[PDB]
Design a protein around this ligand. Structure first.
Ligand SMILES: Nc1nc2c(ncn2[C@@H]2O[C@H](COP(=O)(O)OP(=O)(O)OP(O)(O)=S)[C@@H](O)[C@H]2O)c(=O)[nH]1
Ligand SMILES: *C(=O)[C@@H](N)Cc1ccccc1
Ligand SMILES: [K+]
Ligand SMILES: [K+]
Ligand SMILES: [Mg+2]
Ligand SMILES: [Mg+2]
Ligand SMILES: [Mg+2]
Ligand SMILES: [Mg+2]
Ligand SMILES: [Mg+2]
Ligand SMILES: [Mg+2]
Ligand SMILES: [Mg+2]
Ligand SMILES: [Mg+2]
Ligand SMILES: [Mg+2]
Ligand SMILES: [Mg+2]
Ligand SMILES: [Mg+2]
Ligand SMILES: [Mg+2]
Lengths: 59, 71, 444, 65, 185
RNA sequence: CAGGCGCGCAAAUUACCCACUCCCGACCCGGGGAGGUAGUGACGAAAAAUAACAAUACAGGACUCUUUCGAGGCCCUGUAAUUGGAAUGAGUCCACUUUAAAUCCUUUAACGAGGAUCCAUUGGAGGGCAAGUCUGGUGCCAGCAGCCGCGGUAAUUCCAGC
RNA sequence: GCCCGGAUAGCUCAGUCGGUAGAGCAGGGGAUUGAAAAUCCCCGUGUCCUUGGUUCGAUUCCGAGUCCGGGCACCA
């Protein structure tokens, strides 16, 4: 017995609540962007001792 | 049904609600599924995928850049 | 050097439009003699020998086999003062759609009414198209009328003054009700089959002392149909506006490609200009502008012209699409628009959700009545009551309309030509109206 | 800085003879305002149809048109 | 049918492996210190170094009696000395193999403007160069990757028409001065 | 050679010129869609913008001294931080040059940057493979997923925001 | 542009000249399961393509239009 069908195609995309992108500053581009990465990864290295936190750590 | 030779194939339509853009008897640009003539993933025996419909890209339709040529 | 005017021939079925036009073109030199005998022999062998001059315009196999005009046909000829492009419109009510396409792109309308025993009454009856055609001509903006009573040879007695005079009195009455001032209209007794009183006065009507027209900007007098054409007032061409050219057909000329043909309404069309088509949203530079097989350097308003576009298929642009400059104010699709509509004759009651066929320029799209905004006065849009719930015949109202298929329209105020319309239903002209505001989609 | 090339002639009459025509026109010396190559080619092929001294007349009679 | 030349080549070679952490970190470190817009810039110098070091390798394979070893062996060393990556006391092909990436791109024009003291940051170096402020001998050079040679290292300085120097002021202050002249009266 | 149609997933202007390159001819003089020139051109290749600085500020290192604390100046970094006025070319636009004539490029005068809105995208974020077990929605559906696999009401993988 | 036929539940197919559209299949809700399937209970879930005409009234009567299918034609 098949539960999916062609009438319900694109269901979750339609029902997903719509949240708008918020106005934010433009990101630095080109050499300036590579400058930002260099500082965030190598210059501002705060020691942690225990274990490394990823660039996008959420814990 | 391919125009150049009249052969009949089954083409997968990618993404969430893209089948709604397609209607019956529309000109569709079709490409391979990436496995050089073999089925991809769990879809059984489908070796093709749809890239453009009604001479407009499925991605631009899915991303809201353009709309099914409404006449 | 001449002035180009667009002339539409209108009237009831079998009133002699095509014959009158074909003979008039032949007399003025628009077609070679030898071609007429080619038509004369071939029409007789098909069993339609009476359509000898009608075959000049009836080019289709179906038109020639059945002796009926189905679609408009254009031809050119010169009246020693006007370079005239004449349009032959079908007389059938089933082909009123092709009329409105041809009639829209016209500057003067010649109305052909058959002076025959019982033939005239059939045209001017309720179920005839003589009344309807004159009504649509005024609705579509044609403000210059020439009434030529045809088939005068077939009266009883032939070339009867009394028949001619009674038709003038009756036709005048109608034209006056619908807007045309009879004193500004030239009535010409003609015999399209025999070519009587079209170029030179006919001995068969010595009683006819001529026609007189009393018009502002000139009073004219004459006897023949050609002199009636020569008295047409020169139309005013809106040249200082962005380009607007409603398409009436698209052809695939061998060795040239896609050549959309249509009449430019406003602005100037020149080769090398990048034009855009609405509502199909196709932008392309024009390669050449040709009119009547003759090369052009610029298409001034009122020049029905065809033009070569680059890398455009025939299927992309169709009849009813509007062509305009991409650099200047470009035409755009209308999601909806607001109209002042006067209901003429609907048997019942008109409420929101009504979907009659709306005819604007060359576009015939079934538009849906979305909201009855308010009831206004007829002679002046003075409001009367908000939200009429329903409208019946004789009521003028403000209506918001949402077309079914994509359609490009403009307000009458900015561009008079592409705002006029006629709602059509029940095989009748239900209502007419003008367009005040257009909700153009951004298309970006 | 700006480099370049210069030619200085013994006399103007010599500069008349052995010098490119375009550089002469740059000084207004030998100016010509002629027809396009296409118009000449149109005329040349039209004259190829006719024969005799009529060749000059009809080609010249159709050149302004 | 055409008087054109189609001779062209790529100045760089992409990595064999797209996402290798150590290579990514080292390339970022280099881009960061020598102020380089993109990772293509680290690969261009890497490609030039690889071709040069590869060229030195078959020469070292050939014996010292090889005439071919001597000619382009001497020429290759001379080019390296001229651009300033090899010391004039270093006339051995064996010493080319010890060259590193930072050596070649240390000779870049943008690094020299910051080092010579013309610019106060490596990112200020590119801005000055791209804005037409630096001459080498007498010619303004707006290419940050301009490889300075020893013959021209001593001559790098501000351009004559640069407002920073014997130059009429730049447009932004010109607009303030007329404001000052208008503001005064 | 352009240009049209058809075919197709699939490929440009019905442009200007003999000035260059060279060819033919009785010929220093004529002609040449050969060829050159511009147009279209993200086929492909090369160079290279989308900021930089200075101070205040707040964490943080940093350099020294000192009750360990603490302190002072100094180097460095994150903040459409608080600003501030410097710089410039994309752009528009005299001339000039370019060139057969033009064009672009090169130069120059004017003008032209703060949200310097003059606003960089395309793909991905379980592993292979660089990057969240964040939050909302859906609930073996919708979808994803080159492969392994994810989804059956707390999805590191769908649809979204960050 | 012209002509011909069709349009009723998610699918298919019924439906009297005019007395307020059903059948099967599918699906939904509940019991059950970790979630299903099976099993056991309940539920048409459809603007009769759209819109006007006429009628006491319209899916079934007649027009206009849209889409689909078929055929014909269209050379500034
Ligand atoms: N006696 C007479 N017969 C005429 C005259 N004009 C036309 N006819 C005949 O009437 C018939 C119909 O003419 P026709 O040309 O078809 O009119 P029409 O208005 O163009 O017809 P349609 O296109 O609206 S269908 C033809 O057979 C023609 O021979 C006329 O002036 N006098
Ligand atoms: C072309 O020139 C247009 N005037 C349209 C047209 C004229 C004559 C015949 C057919 C089309
Ligand atoms: K030459
Ligand atoms: K995500
Ligand atoms: Mg598998
Ligand atoms: Mg009859
Ligand atoms: Mg006719
Ligand atoms: Mg008949
Ligand atoms: Mg007829
Ligand atoms: Mg009768
Ligand atoms: Mg020559
Ligand atoms: Mg930008
Ligand atoms: Mg991965
Ligand atoms: Mg990883
Ligand atoms: Mg959840
Ligand atoms: Mg059905």
């Amino acid at each position: 017995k098949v539960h999916g069908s062609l009438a319900r195609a694109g269901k979750v995309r339609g029902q997903t609540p719509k949240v708008a992108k918020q106005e934010k500053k433009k990101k630095k581009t080109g050499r300036a962007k590579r400058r930002m990465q260099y500082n965030r990864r190598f210059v501002n290295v705060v020691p942690t001792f225990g274990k490394k936190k990823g660039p996008n750590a959420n814990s | 049904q391919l125009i150049k030779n009249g052969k009949k194939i089954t083409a997968f339509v990618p993404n969430d609600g893209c089948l709604n853009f397609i209607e019956e008897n529309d000109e569709v640009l079709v490409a391979g599924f990436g496995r050089k003539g073999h089925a991809v993933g769990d879809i059984p025996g489908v070796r093709f995928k749809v890239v453009k419909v009604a001479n407009v890209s499925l991605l631009a339709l899915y991303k809201g850049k353009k709309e099914r040529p409404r006449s | 050097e001449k002035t180009h005017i667009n002339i539409v021939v209108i009237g009831h079925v079998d009133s002699g439009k095509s014959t009158t036009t074909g003979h008039l073109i032949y007399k003025c030199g628009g077609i070679d003699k030898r071609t007429i005998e080619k038509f004369e022999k071939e029409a007789a062998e098909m069993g339609k020998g009476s359509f000898k001059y009608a075959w000049v315009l009836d080019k289709l196999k179906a038109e020639r086999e059945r002796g009926i005009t189905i679609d408009i046909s254009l031809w050119k000829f010169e009246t020693s003062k006007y370079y005239v492009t004449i349009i032959d419109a079908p007389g059938h009510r089933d082909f009123i759609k092709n009329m409105i396409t041809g009639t829209s792109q016209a500057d003067c309308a010649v109305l052909i009414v058959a002076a025959g025993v019982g033939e005239f009454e059939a045209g001017i009856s309720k179920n005839g198209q003589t009344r309807e055609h004159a009504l649509l001509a005024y609705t579509l903006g044609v403000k210059q009328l020439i009434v030529g009573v045809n088939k005068m040879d077939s009266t009883e007695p032939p070339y009867s003054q009394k028949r001619y005079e009674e038709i003038v009195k009756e036709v005048s009455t109608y034209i006056k009700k619908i807007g045309y001032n009879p004193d500004t209209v030239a009535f010409v007794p003609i015999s399209g089959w025999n070519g009587d009183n079209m170029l030179e006065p006919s001995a068969n009507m010595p009683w006819f002392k001529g026609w007189k027209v009393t018009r502002k900007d000139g009073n004219a007098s004459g006897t023949t149909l050609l002199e009636a054409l020569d008295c047409i007032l020169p139309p005013t061409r809106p040249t200082d506006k962005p380009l607007r050219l409603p398409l009436q057909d698209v052809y695939k000329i061998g060795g040239i490609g896609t050549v959309p043909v249509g009449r430019v309404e406003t602005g100037v069309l020149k080769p090398g200009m990048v034009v855009t088509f609405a509502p199909v949203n196709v932008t392309t530079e024009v390669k050449s502008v040709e009119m009547h097989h003759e090369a052009l350097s610029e298409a001034l308003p009122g020049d029905n012209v065809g033009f070569n576009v680059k890398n455009v298929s025939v299927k992309d642009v169709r009849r009813g699409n509007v062509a305009g400059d991409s650099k200047n104010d470009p035409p755009m699709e209308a999601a909806g628009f607001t109209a002042q509509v006067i209901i003429l004759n609907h048997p019942g009651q008109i409420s929101a959700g009504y979907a009659p066929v709306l005819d604007c320029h060359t576009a015939h799209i079934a538009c849906k009545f979305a909201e009855l905004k308010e009831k206004i006065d007829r002679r002046s849009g003075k409001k009367l009551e908000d939200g009429p719930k329903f409208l019946k015949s004789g009521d003028a109202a403000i209506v918001d309309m949402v077309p079914g298929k994509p359609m490009c329209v403009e307000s009458f105020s900015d561009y008079p030509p592409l705002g006029r319309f006629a709602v059509r239903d029940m095989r009748q002209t239900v209502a007419v109206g003008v367009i005040k505001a257009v909700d153009k989609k951004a298309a970006g | 800085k700006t480099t370049g090339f210069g030619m200085i002639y013994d006399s103007l009459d010599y500069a008349k003879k052995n010098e490119p025509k375009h550089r002469l026109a740059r000084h207004g010396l030998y100016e010509k305002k002629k027809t396009s190559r296409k118009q000449r080619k149109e005329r040349k092929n039209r004259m190829k149809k006719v024969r005799g001294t009529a060749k000059a007349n009809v080609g010249a009679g159709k050149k302004p048109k | 049918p055409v008087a054109r030349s189609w001779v062209c080549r790529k100045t760089y070679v992409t990595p064999r492996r797209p996402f290798e952490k150590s290579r990514l970190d080292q390339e970022l470190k280099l881009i960061g210190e020598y102020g380089l817009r993109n990772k293509r810039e680290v690969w261009r110098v890497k490609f030039t170094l690889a071709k040069i070091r590869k060229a030195a390798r078959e020469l070292l394979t050939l014996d010292e009696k090889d005439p071919r070893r001597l000619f382009e062996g001497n020429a290759l060393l001379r080019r390296l000395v001229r651009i300033g990556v090899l010391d004039e006391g270093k006339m051995k092909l064996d010493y080319i193999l010890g060259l590193k990436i930072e050596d070649f791109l240390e000779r870049r024009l943008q690094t020299q403007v910051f080092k010579l003291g013309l610019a106060k940051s490596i990112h200020h170096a590119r801005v000055l160069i791209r804005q037409r402020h630096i001459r080498v001998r007498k010619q303004v050079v707006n290419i940050p990757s301009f490889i300075v040679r020893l013959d021209s290292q001593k001559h790098i300085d501000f351009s004559l028409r640069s407002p920073y120097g014997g130059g009429r002021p730049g447009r932004v202050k010109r607009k303030n001065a007329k404001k000052g002249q208008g503001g005064a009266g």
